[PDB]
Design a protein around this motif. Structure first.
Motif, mmCIF file in Angstrom:
data_model
loop_
_atom_site.group_PDB
_atom_site.id
_atom_site.type_symbol
_atom_site.label_atom_id
_atom_site.label_comp_id
_atom_site.label_asym_id
_atom_site.label_seq_id
_atom_site.Cartn_x
_atom_site.Cartn_y
_atom_site.Cartn_z
ATOM 1 N N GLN A 141 0.788 -1.210 0.000
ATOM 2 C CA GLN A 141 0.000 0.000 0.000
ATOM 3 C C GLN A 141 0.830 1.274 0.000
ATOM 4 O OE1 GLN A 141 -2.866 -2.238 -1.092
ATOM 5 N NE2 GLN A 141 -3.465 -0.029 -1.017
ATOM 6 N N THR A 142 1.906 1.327 0.813
ATOM 7 C CA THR A 142 2.760 2.498 0.922
ATOM 8 C C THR A 142 4.186 2.046 0.835
ATOM 9 O OG1 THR A 142 2.711 2.265 3.380
ATOM 10 C CG2 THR A 142 1.149 3.761 2.400
ATOM 11 N N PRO A 143 4.536 1.631 -0.352
ATOM 12 C CA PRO A 143 5.856 1.088 -0.653
ATOM 13 C C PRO A 143 7.029 2.066 -0.449
ATOM 14 C CG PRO A 143 4.524 1.410 -2.736
ATOM 15 C CD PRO A 143 3.653 1.839 -1.544
ATOM 16 N N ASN A 144 6.866 3.341 -0.823
ATOM 17 C CA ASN A 144 7.972 4.268 -0.663
ATOM 18 C C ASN A 144 8.312 4.466 0.807
ATOM 19 O OD1 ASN A 144 8.642 4.728 -3.428
ATOM 20 N ND2 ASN A 144 6.862 6.047 -3.619
ATOM 21 N N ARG A 145 7.273 4.677 1.585
ATOM 22 C CA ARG A 145 7.444 4.842 2.998
ATOM 23 C C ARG A 145 7.967 3.537 3.586
ATOM 24 N NH1 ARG A 145 3.569 7.071 7.312
ATOM 25 N NH2 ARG A 145 4.716 6.885 9.295
ATOM 26 N N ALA A 146 7.297 2.409 3.255
ATOM 27 C CA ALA A 146 7.731 1.124 3.782
ATOM 28 C C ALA A 146 9.220 0.913 3.484
ATOM 29 C CB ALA A 146 6.868 -0.062 3.341
HETATM 30 CL CL LIG Z 1 4.389 5.522 0.151
#
Ligand SMILES: [Cl-]
Ligand SMILES: [Cl-]
Length: 164
Positions: A141-146
């Motif tokens: 869902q939030t790959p960049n943050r993850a």
């Molecule tokens: Cl993200």
């Protein structure tokens, strides 16, 4: 870099009620107001949180105040949680900040559910934990943050954040 700065980069800063990545209502620096679909429910939680009739808008100071309460609560929640505390106590300072970030994002309960990853982190198997953390809705869902948090756990450094 420290937790505050790290989360401020991941969540941003908005002074007016907004919908988060999941459609819920937040304000400030990732402060969740309500999961409910009503903007009124949200304005109400908001005035109750700030102690004044806000009308969906707060100042910077007010936002930072919520933020401070939210970080503190994240830490306190990790420390009182039987599955989390041990992990947290076993980590170095940087990696502790990565665990607080996930808790602030997803709640103590959500995090405590990453059983296999928690164990690997506790064992100091960095690369394995990173691969395991990635197999999650969170990552999808939030790959960049993850990716930033995972790199943080993998490396023990603030590299994913220097430049931002
Ligand atoms: Cl993200
Ligand atoms: Cl509150």
């Amino acid at each position: 870099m420290n937790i505050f700065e790290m989360l401020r980069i991941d969540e941003g800063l908005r002074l007016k009620i907004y919908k988060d990545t999941e459609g819920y209502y937040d304000i400030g620096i990732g402060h969740l107001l309500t999961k409910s679909p009503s903007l009124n429910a949200a304005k109400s939680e908001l005035d109750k949180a700030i102690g004044r009739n806000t009308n969906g808008v707060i100042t910077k100071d007010e936002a930072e105040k919520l933020f401070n309460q939210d970080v503190d609560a994240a830490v306190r929640g990790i420390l009182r949680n039987a599955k989390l505390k041990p992990v947290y106590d076993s980590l170095d300072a940087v990696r502790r900040a990565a665990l607080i970030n996930m808790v602030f994002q997803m709640g103590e309960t959500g995090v405590a559910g990453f059983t296999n990853s928690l164990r690997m982190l506790q064992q100091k198997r960095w690369d394995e934990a990173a691969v395991n953390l990635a197999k999650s809705r969170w990552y999808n869902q939030t790959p960049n943050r993850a990716k930033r948090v995972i790199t943080t756990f993998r490396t023990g450094t603030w590299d994913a954040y220097k430049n931002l």
